[PDB]
Design a protein around this nucleic acid. Structure first.
Lengths: 118, 35, 79, 60, 267, 344, 70, 443
RNA sequence: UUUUUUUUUUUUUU
RNA sequence: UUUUUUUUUUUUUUUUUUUUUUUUUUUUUUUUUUUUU
RNA sequence: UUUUUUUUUUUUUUUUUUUUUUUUUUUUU
RNA sequence: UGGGAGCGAAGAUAAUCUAAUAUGUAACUCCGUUCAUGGAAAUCAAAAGAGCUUUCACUGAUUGUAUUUAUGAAACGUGAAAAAAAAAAAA
RNA sequence: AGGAGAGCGUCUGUUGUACAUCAACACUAGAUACCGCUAAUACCACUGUAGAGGUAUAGUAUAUAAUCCCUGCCCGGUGCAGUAACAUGUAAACGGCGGCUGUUGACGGUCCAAAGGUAGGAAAAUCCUUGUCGGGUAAUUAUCGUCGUGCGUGAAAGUUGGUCCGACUCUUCACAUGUCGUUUAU
RNA sequence: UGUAACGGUACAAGCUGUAAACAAAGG
RNA sequence: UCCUAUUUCCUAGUACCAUUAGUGAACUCAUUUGGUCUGAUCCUAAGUACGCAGUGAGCUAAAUAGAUACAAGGAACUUGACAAGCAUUAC
RNA sequence: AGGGCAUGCAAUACCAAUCAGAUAACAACUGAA
RNA sequence: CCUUUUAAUUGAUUAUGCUGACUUUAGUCCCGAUAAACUACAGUUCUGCUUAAACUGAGGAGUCAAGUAGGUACAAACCGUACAAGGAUUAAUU
């Protein structure tokens, strides 16, 4: 039987090694999800007379509700402004880190296939 | 030390006992560098 | 002591020990152990040796002795 | 009195000695003692640029 | 990571070298070996092979209880193939219909027609029990036991089984250029039959080619079954393909022909 | 073997093992009632199973029942020379017991302590390591209510002085039970309050008639027989109460038990276990015994008896190794209040 | 031991009469070496026996000089 | 504890038996090794679903799917045909990389479907300039495996390979050459250029491991010039150690064919070189297990009924013979099949023609039996016997093998379908005769 | 005491 | 009778697990869905 | 042929040792 | 570190033995030393009066505990060194 | 390490000793005492473990020694059991068991006590280092048989012992023999 | 911080850390 | 067309570490020629169709430790039958 | 200090109930430092 | 030099005293079971023991110690020796 006996950790029921293929019940999952969901329950505040800018120029946007935000191209900083100190050339170039799709621009360059099939 | 005896003892480096003396080649009064 | 590093024996090694002692000399892994004693080797973990072309190289290991004087003479011109 | 390197290494080795309620202040040839040994001396008339003094406090 | 880890070929343990003592362990490890599994276990293991039999055993009561006794027994398990190729279509269909009828009766239980059903089941159960039990033979009879019994080991009776040769010039012309240009043994009667069972042996086709690839020391003289082995055992004119299925209750042999009693045999 | 949380229990909220088969519990209740009524219809015997009746049945069973007169010549392995003298007592087809191996799924390895506690010191003196043994899974609780079970064979228990029986239910589940002196391979048993008064049958104390031989009596409701399990032991019914049953044990002790508890009818098997005579110390050596050294042949420091020489005599009472008397000295807590004990 | 660490110097203290000579084994070993060189065709014994400044081409010796009077 | 004397003996004997048994197992195990290698520098990072909607799939998706299916050996008709159908629709939006993958998958799977090859070939032909080493190799490799000769495209492939020699891989270059030689689409000039480039490739960027792959008897005697022949033969000797039976066989075959066809070149070799080959033949070369085909068996039965003794299968030095007569060993028959001819045609393959000519040179009375001619006979034995008898009385085949008449996919399909039922009816009739059916139960 | 494409997982057994 | 082995893995059976998966090495063979048996 | 790795079986760690260096956008060629 | 906290026996003296001294000493664990410890009166004194805490000298080997062997920097008081009640309602 | 008489005696097995040179321990067997489950008992971290995953044909403690043999009297006495809320029961538990005097003496007087050595063995693992008589020898006090006084032992304290058995003392018979008077040669 | 192992140096009670006894010249 | 179905399968150049393959107790110990001799197995052997191993010289003193052969007597020796002897002799 | 500086001393403590280890689901579960 | 001072622990044949050297006993004691031959015209010395086969398609049937003990010029030195694929298809070259 070896002298391993007497220790409280001897033949312990349930372990890290023992349990390697066991998953938590959906109850826990549901609970957690719900808990997280129910953290920002409240009424509206502020003012929203006019709809949020979510469409291209010209075309109006009142009925088309969009859950996702849209970023403006004309509002981004330039490379020169970025690299400027504290107090063609790089005066009209912007290097953006984001979703191209979700960008309001005049034109977008896309790489299509030879057959031009989507 | 036997297996049974060794299974119920901790390491000496786990305690502060190693920083409570001044034994050195010079003598019994050791001063740490940059003291 | 009869047994141990006390007579110029040095640290224990595979050679000087019973069968079963696991001790290498430093290497790089190239696979993994299966559940039956086999070993699947992977070619992905092998290092790559990069060497430029040496078919036409004018340079040599050493420098001609006459170089010293020529280099020196250039200094005096700057004076 | 038999010779057993397994026994020897399992009861009297570097990792087995640390678990011993002994006087570690004594110097040990083949052991990890805890006695301080005063290090490298002061500097004479050599190059000041090549005098080593620290490592674990300076590694970067 | 211990004193010694060598295994397999490099066995640290020391074993006896004496051939005399070694010759005694083989007997104990082969003849006096113990088995935990029963006859039924063995039978079931080959359920795929003998589905008919496997189903009849578990369908008709009585046979299951009979084939679980502590006394030694010998059993024969005919193959589905054998049954199929031996039995006529009408007999095979009739047998399968009655087996299915009994299975349906048991399924109905677990789940003048009433009077007629009792008579039909009573007659069919007895017929199938009689059919089934015919194979069972008291006592333990091994393949070697039978072989030896048949005079396979007697030098005075091995004349037609030891010396065998064939035309080597026709099968190995390159290696031969100069040539170019038994008794019946009676077994105890079955449980449900009084008639004995004759058993004999025969020489295989393969046996007539050993000298071409083996060292022979013969003295101076003056369809074919595809099953392997030098010798073929015929138990009542049924060939045995497999045997020596030792168990806790006895032995099981697979035969290539279903044994049918005279009581069931037609005129 | 099992964990403390898995083995330790004070309070029990159940006295039966239910295995419903219908889709709905409403149908299962009706099925259980139907099964109970079916067992009640079959039950026919209600007289007490007395010693005299036991005797009379044993005489019939062991006088004329056993007659086969078989052809043992063919029941043997042909062509097996066997050992050079070593032969079994009897063949497997004529032995009392089963000539085989215990079930693999109904047994486990035995942990030998050698009479040593956790501290590692010797606690129990004269404790050896004999032949290897396997722990048996004996079903002490008759949870299976309203169901019949037939006996297949009888097994040997090295750990017990009595024989076992391989019980098989109609559903085909195998289980071990404590056998009896009457029970033979083929006999059927059932556990239910509506069952008849027959050997093997398990019924409540209250339902059990007066002056009835019983065994495997449980202490608490649905706990298992603990008071009588050994071979040749049995208890008797003396009196009866609305909530208590008076029982006479094997030690001539009168005690009251709950009316709710279960009990078996009959006598434990292997009644003649106390008749064997060991011919040599080899039997004790194999059984797992060790030599016993008397204290008389010890030093004074080792044993009080040491040094002092003397025969039977009458002056100085003997003293054990522990410094405690061992002749007529009661060992029981006087403060411990007597419970259901009537007459001690 | 080559390291000279064991108690093998104890017996040597006492005087002795003589010691074994593994001539049988040594002879065999020498013979095997001789054979291994002979198959190639070089004489080892000859070279191990010739006088310091002595020249003897082939299988020749004192005997050779006998008949070679001229 | 302690054990019974009886049990002790049995346990010890059992234990001993175990040892004996274990000793007795590793006998034939010679070539095994605990260590092994697995190729992993080809799988894609992206995850796909084979069981997905083909419509939602794209070129990239489909390409991945095809290869994953092949690797997992998920041979499903229902699955593969949907892939083919979607591929046909998306044929106009396939990258060279994707195409190659598709091809590799198909080839590895051995999915015999000409309808897709024929449709994907033209698009490959247009994208040849943008093709790469891997794509180029996979195309040809797949084509070769599926046995669909295309001299119009295969040649172009080779030419593009030669153009991109500076960027190609030695292995792919070698495989291209091999494929080309087997398909027989290289004119003399192309052959010459290929040979010249191959020699430099082999001598500059080839090792022991890579060199072995350049050994091919069919290629050697039909593509390779004398200067490359000699170098190949000489380097094989040196690189023989690091070889396999598969390469050994090929080498031997090469030697034999060279000797038989090109005496001059053979004599031009050195003594040492010659000795190698001389000694090689004496060694026992392992071979895979072989057995007669159903066609083979039918032919053999007809022949035996005609009353002629012969053999089923046997080896003759370096070449296998279908049928060999015992009365006249000189005689030999060969049973062809669909695989013996190119897809939709009856043209013999280069290996078949080379083996025919080598034996004809060596003096073997060689006869050939086709399958499309045979099938027509149906399940009649007298017609087959007469068919065989009429052939026997006629002279043997010429040294130089010729091709058969024209054919078509339609005809091929028809023939196949027809034969399908014959092979089943004959089996049923054969199997039924074995059943005695004598036993009659009263019941 | 596990033998040749790697993992997870269920019953029986010479 | 002093009442004796089984888990990793192999084989068989039962299946809706998974590139954590078998050469892009090679041979042989009449051959395989839906609107050719 | 062993050792290595799963199980027996144990951080009952054999100092300067390992399939073990930060844990997959890997540029599939 | 003979500093502080927990626990803490014996050899020895009493010419053996109990208390007692040794000694709250030795071993074990912990704090880590003037940037510490301590502390600004419900104290001491007695019929006057001193005025947080801390070091040295004398009073004094006096008083007291013990006894067969010892132990005891006692309290008030005097001299001297160093001197310290509170920065303060917020912005 | 053989033939025969006789004393002692469960060995096989473990080991060098409780005096005078000649031992112990263990054991087949029987018998007594405690204990009804969270058992008794043991270790002595105390809601623990062993006992035991057992259940009065079970567990543990003490003493004796063959499978059988007939196996004596005594509770005044320490202790335990019981309770008049200090009778009575336990000797197979617990120390042991005798004076004067009268006729070889069945018998008679008297003192004391709970009871007053039973039978058997008996010159002894005990008194005495020569008790009477018989067997052996040219001599026997050594030793066997026997008598039962000379002193004395003493019954589940283990006495006696039929048959069988023997690395246990002793008597006695037979072969060879430098043990020998008494010593030689290689 | 203090030390042990391996490697180099001239194999060493020193030095040293595969860059293992030095960069000294940024127009 | 009378086979138990006429169901393609040699073998991918291969990570790190251990190793003196034979006789011999080769282990603690040490008065250590490693290896011969001292005991059972492993070879159907006229001892294996030549295998392993073998260390200064001289000399009639006596005594001691042993071997072989002793006339007649045969326990007269010794506390004791300790020791020694018998167990091979026409072939 | 221009540059470089393998490996070992078992390290989430530049923080935080205690009790094995890469520092342990409650409870079982206990403690002079 | 004289004179004053010195807490130097300041004084030797001996505690079988501690640490070393060197005499006497004292050219005393101690020496392991079996050797011989290598010539002046050919050859096989005696003895003890008896697992001494190295491809036959099969890794010689195992473990452990030696902290590398049968390599090497009549060397206790220096210098070497551990290949699981057996590299010499080295059947050729000269």
């Amino acid at each position: 039987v070896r002298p391993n006996q007497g220790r409280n950790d001897y033949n312990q029921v349930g372990g890290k090694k023992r349990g390697q293929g066991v998953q938590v019940l959906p109850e826990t999952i549901r609970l957690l999800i719900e808990t997280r969901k129910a953290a920002t329950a409240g009424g509206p505040v502020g003012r929203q007379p006019l709809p949020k800018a979510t469409e291209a120029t010209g075309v109006s946007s009142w009925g088309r509700d969009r859950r996702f935000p849209i970023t403006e191209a004309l509002r981004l900083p330039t490379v020169a402004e970025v690299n400027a100190p504290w107090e063609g050339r790089l005066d009209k170039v912007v290097l953006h880190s984001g979703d191209i799709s979700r960008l309001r621009v005049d034109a977008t360059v896309v790489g299509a296939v030879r057959s031009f099939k989507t | 030390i036997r297996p049974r005896k060794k299974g119920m003892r901790l390491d000496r480096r786990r305690s502060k006992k190693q920083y409570k003396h001044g034994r050195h080649v010079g003598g019994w009064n050791y001063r740490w560098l940059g003291s | 002591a009869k047994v141990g590093p006390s007579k110029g024996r040095g640290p224990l090694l595979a050679k000087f020990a019973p069968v079963g002692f696991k001790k290498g000399f430093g290497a790089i892994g190239l696979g993994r152990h299966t559940k039956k004693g086999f070993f699947i080797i992977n070619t992905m973990l092998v290092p790559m040796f990069k060497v430029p072309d040496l078919s036409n190289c004018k340079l040599k290991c050493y420098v001609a002795p006459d170089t010293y004087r020529i280099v020196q003479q250039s200094f005096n011109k700057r004076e | 009195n038999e010779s057993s390197p397994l026994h020897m290494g399992a009861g009297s080795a570097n990792w087995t000695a640390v678990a011993r309620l002994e006087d570690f202040t004594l110097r040990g040839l083949s052991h990890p003692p805890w006695i301080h040994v005063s290090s490298r001396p002061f500097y004479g008339a050599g190059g000041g640029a090549v005098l080593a003094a620290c490592m674990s406090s300076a590694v970067w | 990571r211990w004193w010694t880890r060598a295994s397999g070929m490099r066995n640290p343990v020391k074993w006896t070298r004496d051939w005399e003592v070694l010759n005694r362990k083989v007997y104990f490890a082969f003849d006096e070996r113990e088995i935990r599994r029963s006859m039924l276990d063995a039978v079931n293991a080959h359920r795929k092979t003998a589905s008919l039999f496997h189903r009849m055993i578990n369908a008709v009561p009585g046979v299951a209880h009979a084939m679980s006794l502590p006394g030694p027994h010998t059993f024969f398990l005919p193959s589905d193939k054998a049954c199929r190729d031996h039995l006529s279509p009408d007999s095979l269909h009739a047998l399968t219909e009655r087996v299915a009828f009994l299975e349906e009766q048991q399924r109905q239980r677990v789940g003048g027609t009433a009077a007629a059903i009792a008579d039909r089941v009573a007659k069919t159960t007895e017929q199938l029990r009689t059919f089934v039990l015919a194979h069972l033979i008291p006592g333990e009879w091994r393949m070697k036991t039978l072989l030896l019994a048949c005079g396979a080991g007697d030098p005075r009776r091995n004349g037609s089984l030891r010396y065998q040769d064939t035309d080597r010039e026709l099968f190995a012309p390159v290696m031969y250029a100069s040539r170019l240009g038994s008794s019946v043994f009676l077994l105890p009667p079955p449980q449900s039959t009084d008639e004995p069972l004759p058993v004999w042996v025969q020489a295989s086709r393969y046996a007539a080619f050993l000298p071409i690839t083996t060292s022979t020391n013969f003295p101076r003289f003056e369809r074919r079954s595809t099953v392997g082995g030098a010798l073929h055992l015929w138990v009542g004119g049924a060939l045995v393909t497999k045997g020596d299925l030792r168990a806790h209750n006895g032995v099981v042999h697979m035969i290539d022909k279903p044994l049918i009693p005279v009581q069931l045999l037609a005129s | 073997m099992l964990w403390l949380a898995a083995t330790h229990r004070n309070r029990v909220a159940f006295q039966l093992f239910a295995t419903p088969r219908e889709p709905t519990a409403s149908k299962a209740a009706a099925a259980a009632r139907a099964a109970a009524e079916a067992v009640a219809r079959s039950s026919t015997v209600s007289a007490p199973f007395t010693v005299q009746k036991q005797q009379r049945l044993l005489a019939l069973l062991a006088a004329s029942s056993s007659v086969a007169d078989p052809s043992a010549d063919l029941f043997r392995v042909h062509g097996l020379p066997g050992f050079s003298g070593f032969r079994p007592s009897s063949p497997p087809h004529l032995s009392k017991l089963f000539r085989g191996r215990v079930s693999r799924h109904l047994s486990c390895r035995r942990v030998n302590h050698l009479g040593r506690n956790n501290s590692g010191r010797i606690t129990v003196r004269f404790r050896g390591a004999g032949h290897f043994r396997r722990l048996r899974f004996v079903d002490y609780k008759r949870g299976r209510k309203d169901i019949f079970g037939t006996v297949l064979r009888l097994e040997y228990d090295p750990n017990r002085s009595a024989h076992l029986a391989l019980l098989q239910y109609d559903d085909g589940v195998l289980s071990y039970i404590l056998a009896t002196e009457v029970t033979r391979p083929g006999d059927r048993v059932v556990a239910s309050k509506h069952a008849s008064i027959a050997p093997g049958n398990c019924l409540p104390l209250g339902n059990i008639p007066v002056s009835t031989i019983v065994h495997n009596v449980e202490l608490r409701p649905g706990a298992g027989g603990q008071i009588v399990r050994a071979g040749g032991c049995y208890a008797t019914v003396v009196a009866k109460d609305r909530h208590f049953v008076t029982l006479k044990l094997s030690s001539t002790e009168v005690r009251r038990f709950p009316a709710d508890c279960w009990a078996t009818v009959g006598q434990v098997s292997n009644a003649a276990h106390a008749e064997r005579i060991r011919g040599k110390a080899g039997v004790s050596y194999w059984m797992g015994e060790r030599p016993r050294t008397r204290g008389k042949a010890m030093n004074p420091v080792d044993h009080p008896h040491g040094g002092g020489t003397g025969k039977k005599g009458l002056k100085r009472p003997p003293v054990s190794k522990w410094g405690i008397l061992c002749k007529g000295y009661k060992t029981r807590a006087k403060k411990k209040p007597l419970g259901l004990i009537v007459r001690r | 031991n080559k390291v000279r660490t064991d108690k093998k110097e104890r017996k040597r203290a006492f005087p002795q009469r003589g010691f074994w000579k593994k001539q049988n084994f040594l002879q065999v070993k020498n013979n095997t070496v001789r054979l291994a060189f002979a198959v190639q065709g070089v004489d080892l014994l000859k070279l191990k026996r010739l006088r310091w400044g002595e020249v003897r081409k082939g299988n020749t010796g004192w005997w050779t000089d006998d008949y070679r009077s001229p | 504890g302690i054990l019974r004397p009886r049990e002790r003996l049995l346990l010890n004997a059992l234990k001993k038996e175990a040892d004996i048994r274990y000793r007795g197992r590793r006998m034939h195990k010679r070539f095994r090794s605990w260590a092994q290698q697995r190729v992993r520098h080809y799988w894609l990072p992206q995850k796909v679903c084979v069981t997905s909607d083909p419509q939602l799939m794209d070129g990239s998706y489909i390409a991945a799917c095809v290869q994953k299916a092949a690797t997992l050996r998920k041979h499903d008709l229902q699955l593969w045909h949907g892939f083919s159908k979607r591929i046909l629709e998306l044929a106009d939006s396939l990258t060279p990389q994707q195409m190659g993958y598709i091809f590799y998958g198909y080839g590895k799977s051995l999915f015999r479907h000409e309808e897709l090859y024929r449709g994907l070939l033209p698009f490959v032909a247009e994208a040849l300039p943008e093709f790469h080493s891997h794509a180029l190799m996979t195309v040809a490799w797949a084509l070769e495996r599926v046995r669909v000769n295309d001299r119009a495209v295969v040649a172009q492939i080779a030419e593009e390979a030669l153009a991109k020699k500076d960027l190609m891989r030695p292995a792919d270059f070698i495989k291209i050459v091999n494929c080309v030689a087997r398909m027989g689409a290289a004119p003399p000039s192309l052959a010459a250029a290929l040979s010249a480039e191959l020699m430099r490739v082999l001598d500059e960027k080839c090792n022991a491991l890579l060199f072995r792959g350049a050994v091919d008897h069919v290629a050697v005697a039909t593509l390779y010039s004398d200067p490359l022949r000699l170098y190949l033969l000489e380097r094989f000797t040196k690189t023989a150690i690091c070889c396999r039976p598969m390469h050994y066989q090929k080498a031997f075959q090469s030697a034999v064919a060279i000797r038989v066809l090109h005496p001059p070149v053979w004599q031009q070799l050195s003594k040492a070189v010659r000795n190698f080959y001389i000694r090689l033949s004496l060694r026992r070369i392992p071979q895979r297990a072989r057995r007669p085909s159903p066609l083979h068996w039918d032919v053999s039965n007809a022949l035996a009924k005609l009353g002629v003794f012969h053999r089923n299968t046997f080896q003759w030095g370096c070449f296998w013979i279908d049928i060999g007569e015992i009365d006249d060993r000189r005689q030999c028959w060969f049973v062809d099949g669909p695989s013996d001819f190119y897809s939709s045609t009856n043209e013999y393959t280069e290996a078949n023609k080379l083996q025919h000519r080598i034996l004809s040179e060596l003096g073997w009375n060689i006869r050939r039996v086709r399958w499309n001619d045979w099938v027509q006979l149906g399940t009649d034995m007298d017609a087959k016997v007469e068919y065989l008898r009429k052939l026997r009385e006629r002279p043997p085949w010429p040294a130089i093998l010729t091709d058969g008449p024209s054919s078509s996919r339609q005809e091929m399909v028809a023939n196949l379908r027809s034969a399908r039922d014959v092979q089943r009816a004959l089996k049923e009739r054969r199997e039924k005769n074995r059943q005695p059916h004598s036993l009659v139960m009263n019941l």
